Symmetry: C2
Subunit: 324 residues, 2 copies
């Protein structure tokens, strides 16, 4: 859409305060894009929970977002937390927003120079029943209580998706997700409003090993191959779901099995993704319900996530129910 991103966000119901916050966050993501382009792969000397060597770029990315939140330019931010420190850290006593982010997602593929990304979940005190309660402010909240979310993909260019959720009843309307592109001067524009079609041609099977002790997942994967669906799976969560918006079709799956439990984080990855997906008319599921309606049990809460084309999310639930 040719109108400015500022105008489009306001048309989606964001006030100037939320609009400015989103634009400021995107600007920090633009700075992460620059850091990635000029920083070599240099190990810090410590592996993450998956065993992936953390790089200097991960710390730089975290610091770019955290330093901004703590600065006077981030005065609207009450508190933040991240995958590297999951506990709320106060930034500004009079700020309104709580931010939960994954500063640089794709630790197993960043060295390969594959596309990676960032994820930001945005909550607002006094909105959707979210009141400041210190450290446990987000406990028992659901994704439907976020006021906005966004993902940013760092590839040959910088792109992303953002959605606003300001309806008092939490109604998320199809066609409210905004596809973004950063101009090389750092300014973001909106290229369109993606609508994820109910039918899919692409499949993206994450946590593939779970199929070995989860028959339903093994059978869905076999089915997708038998029907000649196109395989597209980079191992980076943000790029793997961003493709669904661009192609306006596709299914991403990351189910949980006894042997291969869910590793995706509710607060730093899943809830943000669920909002942008459902704003584009896609469906999400943990096998039972939408990821906008699953309460946060703890800040480290992990969850399965399947998302994308409605018919495939339904096929997944039906197949998991039938087998068995």
């Amino acid at each position: 859409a040719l109108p400015s991103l500022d105008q489009l966000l306001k048309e989606q119901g964001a006030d100037q305060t939320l609009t400015d916050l989103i634009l400021a966050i995107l600007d920090r993501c633009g700075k992460i894009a620059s850091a990635l382009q000029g920083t070599s792969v240099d190990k810090v000397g410590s592996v993450n929970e998956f065993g992936d060597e953390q790089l200097t770029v991960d710390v730089i990315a975290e610091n770019l977002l955290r330093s901004w939140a703590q600065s006077s330019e981030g005065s609207a931010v009450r508190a933040v937390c991240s995958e590297e420190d999951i506990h709320l850290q106060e930034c500004h006593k009079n700020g309104e927003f709580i931010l939960c982010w994954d500063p640089l997602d794709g630790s197993s593929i960043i060295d390969c120079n594959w596309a990676v990304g960032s994820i930001v979940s945005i909550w607002r005190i006094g909105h959707h029943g979210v009141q400041w309660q210190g450290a446990d402010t987000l406990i028992q909240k659901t994704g439907r209580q976020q006021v906005a979310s966004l993902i940013v993909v760092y590839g040959p260019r910088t792109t992303g998706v953002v959605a606003v959720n300001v309806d008092a009843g939490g109604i998320v309307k199809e066609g409210t997700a905004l596809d973004l592109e950063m101009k090389d001067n750092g300014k973001f524009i909106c290229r369109g409003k993606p609508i994820i079609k109910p039918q899919a041609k692409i499949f993206s099977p994450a946590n593939l090993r779970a199929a070995q002790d989860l028959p339903a997942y093994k059978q869905l994967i076999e089915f997708w191959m038998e029907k000649r669906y196109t395989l597209r799976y980079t191992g980076g969560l943000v790029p793997d779901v961003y493709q669904i918006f661009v192609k306006q079709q596709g299914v991403f799956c990351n189910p949980a099995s006894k042997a291969a439990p869910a590793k995706l984080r509710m607060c730093f990855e899943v809830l943000a993704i669920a909002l942008v997906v459902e704003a584009a008319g896609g469906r999400t599921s943990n096998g039972q319900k939408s990821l906008l309606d699953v309460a946060i049990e703890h800040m480290d809460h992990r969850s399965a996530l399947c998302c994308g084309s409605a018919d495939e999310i339904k096929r997944m639930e039906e197949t998991f129910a039938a087998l068995s």
Copy 2:
């Protein structure tokens, strides 16, 4: 740290080949910029950057060129030495998704490895062992690549001579290491997956990789899909041919260049029966299966394709 100029010379390149590689890499730098500041489509912009350079006085060392867009060998400079065959911008089905994409360049040299100028048919019946060099470039958050030089008599590629590259100031690259692809793999990257549906051996190999919990990494972009093998120093990429899903990868523009860099890093390559460096070019549009990476998985693939042939 040693310059790329120094490193290329260490691998056997003379100043002329060194300068050619640096010029090609510089043009790839400009393709990186085109991708960063553009939305003519970028694949057309990339083709034009390489073509215009080759045709200019700056490209005087280039005798002739051809590409995916125009596979016919076209003479640029009568006194040039090199023949270039390139894939300007590869990854058409994923570029819109802002996923990593790449370029591939195969380099031949008149008077070297028995390649003499024969006009349009200069490369007919030539094999990949007759290339003097090749390179791949990956456009992602950074711009990286791999280059190998093949200047020893007989064209028998030495392990540990591939140079992993990273761009700093636009168009200028440094070497980030000399990858050695281990014989054992953890990652599998199954291209042309639909071929498995009428190629039992491929289906069974994929099932095996899944059952043994190999890690799936498959972007759909040829260049990034093979580049990971160099970075991780392990992995297997497969793009086989079946009757219903034939080989689409082009020998002259994709396959031979990749085969040289992989073998220079100690990996193996195969079309199901032999190295892609030993398959004669039958036609400029010649297509071929390509499997490459960790030696043990290439061995597994060849043995399975034989046993489960149907």
